[PDB]
Subunit: 430 residues, 4 copies
């Protein structure tokens, strides 16, 4: 039918491959998955349509799914998140990948539709990040719905949307919540953003974090990671939250907690980690100090009112890709990053490989569960068993040279748990 | 029958009362419980037998239960944890309290038995910390078992024991797991020990934390708090763990993770936050650097092998209460704290009031739930609803001057949650 | 003439001795000074009159000076700073020590005067902390001025006063600035207070630091240490400064920097590390939140206006020694600590031994320099040579197990410095 | 004579100018210098030959010197440190700048020689960073030596070389040590590297810092900044030092301190902040874990033995500019960054603007002192007066919204210092 793939420049493949080479050495989980299942090919017969930012780490994921006997067609879930040299390597590798940095809402949709049909039939598996693929099939291609063995969501918002779908009886295929595995959530969301947020901010503005007032909206795992990152550089972080528990945590950590209505007049850097709309409005923009850097890191771009900036600023000047400086009627400048989209993936290279290995290992595990043990997952959204969760963490201990302790028969008996058996109750929050 | 109470010295009452006065101003949760239920007296008709360290904060708890119409008889759950001036105030207040610092395993048991019978009948409610009261009634006073409306456990180990009791069909009265409320666990266990661990170590040895190698066993909430406390002072913290996930977290936080077999040769300060036996054995003691300070903060005193010290040391010299310096055949000295018992409560005054207010508020809520809505809790161990969990955090926001944000109808709609309604799924780990 | 000594209770000697025993094992610098000079007795013929807080560490110092052949008579430089068991050990050891906790401005002066005359003549050496002894001799006993070989000051304020005395031609004996050795200043003032500030606050109030607003006046070495200590527990530290450089440093570290006029309305804990008067006035007290804990850690008690509290509070109630709760007309309570005096030494046991070893080693070195090489120090205030400064740090490396690197002849040549020779220019600030 | 300038591409001017625009708003010190001296033109008649990395911040510096009436000709002091868009803006602005990224040791020297001669005569002023310009004139163009009014050095090594030159009677023109101003040293070297080190490492490798063992050579201001940056992301930092004082500081901060001989077997990331040769040798390389990232941040590229890598590695593969992966006979890979040159400036954009404003303001002040008050600086190397040092910090307080406190006449009197007058003795180390 359509082309075999389409990227920005396939001349980037060589370089993309070196990156993939270094990347692999940083993601033990994925490589271990390869080590164990390359022969068995547990994913044989699977036609996985994936919609997840096309980065170097997503490239190692794709190739791991393939090494396991799967058949995939990829696409990014963000028009800015793609890493073109990574996409090139994948494309040149024979994998039909349809993504490139800077697509248009139009081309974006074209790419997703490109992954729906395989050589010997339509997709029978979904690996989503954001729920775009699953929402597309569900609302536009209902016919394919019954041929999909399972879904694999990894984003807080997406998984949130899934639970909602079920709550309304809209979900029609078994889904697995991968975001809520301890190794994914407590490490990706938190440790990931702690490292990739300032990377985006810096590569984009090269601003000095130290001595600045950074306002972080939301103290969830992402906000926790961002608040920590900024704090460590010498910034005075102010937090805004709607949850009294998350609010108390910020307070116990020495962060002042106020409303954006108040904080906007103080902040020097604004970071939205909220999962919802209307976090930074024009009423706030009008208060901001000159040259205030505004950016969003929550999965979607609905948190900052960019339209307002565009329709109220005296003038807008692009400094470079994904970096705009608006001049407001008050004579104050505002530096918007990545047009209100994910700053780490849009102005930088996303989370580091090591941490992505945790999430993606969880991803590969979900793909094998749903595909290999279907009758184990009725229509609804499930979690990965704790044993697999701990296995995922275990796989990365070696690289870090961590030496785990082994319970003695006596201890295991005293604690009333197995030497290896899950070490924590299902309600444990780590 | 027996005496009305028994403490170390009732002459301490005056001072204990001033402490309670200042304490109250630090525990908004308890005071708010008083504010709302003093009139209704939801605990009227309840005869609560409590077994929880008798400290200033436990004093404010006792008086809060009483202000709610309850009838109580207290006792500490530790022979060293009691704060005598606090006990005096309670005793002098007409509350039959039977506890004092430095009891003997014999007197310890006598005190618990003293709380079992009230003026108009035996205890019909349990407020335990460690499971000693609930295990006593269950195995020694089974007759009273059917008159108890419910249990209230707050310790990780105790709640662990409860879940075990049910698993074996031994639990005969509905129990509520208070330790696992987010406001209890993530704040008491973690933030509490972060503050009270060094307090105990310092008051006992006055040692300098900076530049020392502190070895922390277990990276759970307690270990997390201790590791952070020690790190913040300039100590090099090494962690030991059996859980791969908790191990990875330590690693992601920059803590070296090894086995005690290896760390014992390096440590300058040892802290066991494990919930199990045989953490520090003689084989380790023999390796320790001269004057190594050893102490335990995990609920029980089974983690450090003190017997070994006692039966192998060339000689033992007490420096002062709860501080002993053993001389080993190798010519190395070892400073044991609180005889291997909880260091923060035995060498210091336990956790600060503000944080105890969180747990105790949870405690008061469980007492009212079990007492007031019995048919809501069949025999087994339950959790407090999230709504109550968030209410507990909310109650402490004011004192800290935190300004919570309120979702707009639009946002509440977008997120698909209530403006007030619980803001997180039951699986949320914060 | 007068008594041989006078302390609070000589029955404390035994216990004081065990503390001294443990202390010695923590002060390698002093012990090494003992190791090398016990035989030579470089201080033989010296009659050192000392005025320095009489604590366990000052006890090890005293005994070290004696092991070096010196003759001493001690006294504390604070009426609250004395550690009675430590004084008892020294007194019982035959050393005429005249100090005890809780003296009166009257007894304080009597004690200092007690150290001026020795068996075979008046004092011929001064070891001061605060300048009280040197100012006493200079203004009250000028006759003894010409028999004193040298002065040894260790406090920022005292050394400040010395430089002033010289600037006005009032100093009549060679003094050595010991505070300004790198090993004293950057370690004692900073790391010391980082550890002993919260100790004092906690032992006194047992308040929870986390989630509180702590206001620190002055960002010098002491303020730096305090700000860091409070920050590490979860407090939101606000800083006040008069120096633009020290102010910028605070900002670069993420601390908001405002005026006390503004901060008083926000603070929950106030710490004055300033070296001057009128830091916290009544105008501030009237603004403070209820139960605000106020304390001072700067050498003198002139920073907090305690008189005002005493003359304007509706009522004052002592909670226990060195802890008072004033009720203000506005209905707000204010918890004053140590009556506005050094909180770490007055409500706790001062700085830990390890760090005091650094200062005291510097102290012993100055005593030997001034005594042994007099013609090397004309009347004026001098510094210890860098070689001795590095020697002091070196002496503590072993205990911490630090492995120092040794320049190769090639490297030493490239850098143009000696393998051992001082490694930094005199202007180096570390 | 020669061309008017030479850069990589003048088409970059537009973009470089937008960067300069944003940069200006981040460097208050330079802008304030402009505000005050633009009219007076204190640098009129000056022909400043500058040799300092040609970055956006150096661009704002150049334009500030020009706004003050100076005449300049620039060149970078590093063949990789140049920021081409910044150079283009300067070149297109009419300023003869001769620098571009990726020059050859040959072109490097050509550029410096290009700045020596101006329209109306040779250079009469030097603004150096590294001592290359001053060492060139001194050893190659001695004739011009007597026409230069003064030197301005800002690098630790350069200033080190200057002191050496004087010590040997080689220095023939008054020099000013700008690196050793408190506002330069404690902020640039320390806070600068804290922010720009990981930027270079990340942009180059995109490696995850968390959970890695980072080995930092040298604990001076740079090492302090690097150690702190790495620590804050979750890395376990090990320190190596030759100075016992700097070593004790690292220890007191919780960093293990060992020899490179030992640490090389453990490190995952190596950073040399030393100011000398032979820090990382082949004997170390042969021990490093696979894919160990090695980089240098100390001013020169003599710290890592790159020649060895080049002459002993089985094979070398370039991943991209300034990023090479060597394969060692042992089968271990080694990732070298920026060919052993400054990693922050070579793989990233150097220090942020705000902090560079501090150094550069000091630089402008030195240019005016040497030029304007010549007879104030005889041949030798001097420091800027404290008043100017504090002025520099003061100038950046506003942007950060810091509210400095003002001593009262009473306080100023008590402290014995002026309300504005320098607030610290010359030996103060901050
Ligand atoms: N760009 C990335 O690399 C990346 C990585 C992980 C997650 N995410 C996205 O970031 C978002 C946050 O994820 P998370 O795991 O931290 O979610 P989370 O649920 O843990 O936390 C979000 C927090 O926002 C708070 N909040 C909600 N509305 C708010 C408002 N109006 N004002 C202030 N606070 C508010 C909530 O109380 C909650 O604690 C999600 O959309 C997720 O998909 C992005
Ligand atoms: N003294 C106090 O103030 C106080 C306050 C709260 C809890 N506690 C007690 O401390 C203990 C720990 O509580 P928690 O909430 O942190 O529990 P937790 O379950 O969160 O963590 C305990 C950790 O220990 C690790 N562990 C178990 N056996 C180990 C071993 N042999 N070696 C190394 N690590 C091992 C586990 O993997 C786990 O992560 C409990 O007994 C609890 O009752 C004391
Ligand atoms: N109790 C102890 O254990 C202990 C230990 C060391 C020093 N000290 C004492 O603490 C004091 C401070 O010592 P240091 O070494 O940190 O001194 P320092 O000179 O380094 O710092 C004091 C700081 O106070 C700032 N300051 C001055 N007046 C101020 C005002 N009105 N408002 C705000 N800030 C102001 C100054 O700019 C300076 O940076 C001295 O009196 C010293 O003797 C006490
Ligand atoms: N790239 C940049 O942005 C940047 C910024 C400032 C300074 N620098 C450069 O970095 C270097 C360090 O500057 P600094 O201000 O921190 O110098 P510094 O003098 O403060 O510290 C260097 C430290 O190295 C230690 N050291 C010396 N030889 C050693 C060895 N063989 N092993 C271990 N430690 C050793 C010294 O004891 C000293 O403490 C200088 O060359 C300087 O020009 C670079
Ligand atoms: N390097 C990377 N590759 C792929 C995806 C990446 C990424 N960095 C961040 N995300 C975003 C996700 O981590 C986020 O949406 C999630 O929820 O896991
Ligand atoms: N001040 C205090 N009063 C009462 C109890 C106190 C305490 N500090 C610590 N615990 C121990 C509990 O926090 C612990 O066993 C728990 O699990 O909550
Ligand atoms: N344990 C202790 N012994 C003696 C003195 C002690 C002390 N702690 C603090 N100071 C105060 C000094 O550190 C301080 O005034 C100084 O300037 O050195
Ligand atoms: N953005 C930048 N512009 C110019 C120079 C820069 C720089 N970043 C670091 N250096 C290096 C200097 O900070 C260093 O060599 C010094 O000693 O000041």
């Amino acid at each position: 039918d359509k082309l075999p793939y389409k990227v920005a420049d396939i001349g980037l493949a060589a370089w993309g491959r070196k990156a993939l080479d270094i990347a692999e050495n940083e993601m033990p989980g994925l490589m271990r998955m390869r080590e164990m299942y390359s022969a068995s090919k547990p994913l044989k017969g699977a036609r996985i349509a994936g919609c997840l930012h096309m980065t170097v780490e997503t490239a190692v994921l794709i190739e791991t799914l393939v090494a396991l006997g799967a058949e995939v067609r990829w696409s990014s879930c963000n028009i800015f998140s793609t890493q073109d040299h990574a996409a090139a390597a994948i494309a040149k590798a024979g994998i039909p990948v349809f993504a490139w940095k800077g697509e248009t809402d139009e081309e974006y949709l074209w790419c997703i539709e490109q992954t729906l049909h395989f050589k010997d039939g339509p997709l029978n598996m979904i690996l989503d990040d954001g729920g775009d693929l699953t929402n597309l099939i569900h609302t536009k291609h209902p016919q394919l719905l019954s041929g999909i063995r399972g879904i694999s969501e990894e984003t807080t918002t997406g998984v949130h949307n899934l639970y909602k779908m079920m709550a309304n009886g809209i979900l029609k295929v078994p889904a697995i919540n991968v975001n809520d595995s301890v190794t994914k959530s407590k490490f990706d969301n938190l440790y990931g953003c702690r490292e990739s947020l300032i990377d985006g901010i810096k590569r984009a503005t090269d601003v000095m974090i130290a001595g600045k007032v950074a306002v972080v909206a939301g103290y969830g795992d992402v906000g926790k990671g961002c608040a920590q990152a900024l704090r460590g550089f010498g910034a005075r972080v102010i937090i805004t939250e709607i949850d009294p528990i998350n609010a108390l945590q910020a307070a116990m950590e020495g962060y002042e907690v106020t409303t954006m209505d108040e904080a906007c007049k103080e902040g020097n850097i604004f970071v939205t980690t909220t999962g919802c709309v209307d976090i930074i409005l024009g009423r706030h923009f009008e208060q901001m100090k000159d040259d205030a850097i505004v950016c969003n890191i929550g999965h979607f771009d609905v948190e900052i009112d960019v339209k307002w900036l565009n329709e109220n600023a005296v003038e807008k000047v692009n400094i470079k890709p994904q970096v705009d400086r608006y001049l407001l009627k008050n004579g104050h400048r505002i530096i918007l990053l990545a047009e209100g989209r994910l700053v780490n993936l849009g102005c930088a290279m996303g989370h580091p490989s090591f941490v992505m290995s945790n999430s993606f290992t969880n991803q590969v595990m979900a793909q094998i569960e749903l595909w290999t043990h279907p009758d184990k997952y009725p229509v609804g959204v499930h979690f990965l068993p704790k044993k697999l969760d701990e296995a995922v963490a275990e796989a990365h201990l070696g690289k870090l040279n961590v030496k785990l302790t082994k319970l003695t028969e006596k201890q295991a008996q005293y604690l009333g748990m197995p030497i290896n058996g899950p070490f924590k109750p299902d309600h444990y929050r780590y």
